[PDB]
Amino acid sequence: FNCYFPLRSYSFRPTYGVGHQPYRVVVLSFELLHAPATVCGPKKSTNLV
Amino acid sequence: FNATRFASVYAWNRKRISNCVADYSVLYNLAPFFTFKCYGVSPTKLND
């Protein structure tokens, strides 16, 4: 009574409809800031003018 | 609850409830142990 286990399982089944098929999500977070950049796009440099 | 029943296995009795203030905290004294299974709504937040 008023005691619950928070963990529940999806139990995915292919026979389920569109709203129950499992989906894989990858969330990318960037941080545009004044600090020096480590990761950068694939672009070609040029001589200093 | 706390009332007589009819042989409604074939013909379930339907009660329409409207225009009232509903409380569920009193339904926890039905028996020493009973199932309060819920589908589609979490057991909590029912009042809200």
Ligand SMILES: *[C@@H]1O[C@H](CO)[C@@H](O)[C@H](O)[C@H]1NC(C)=O
């Ligand atoms: C139902 O009856 C039992 C025993 O008579 C009592 O303990 C309980 O409070 C009652 N519940 C309601 C909702 O009247």
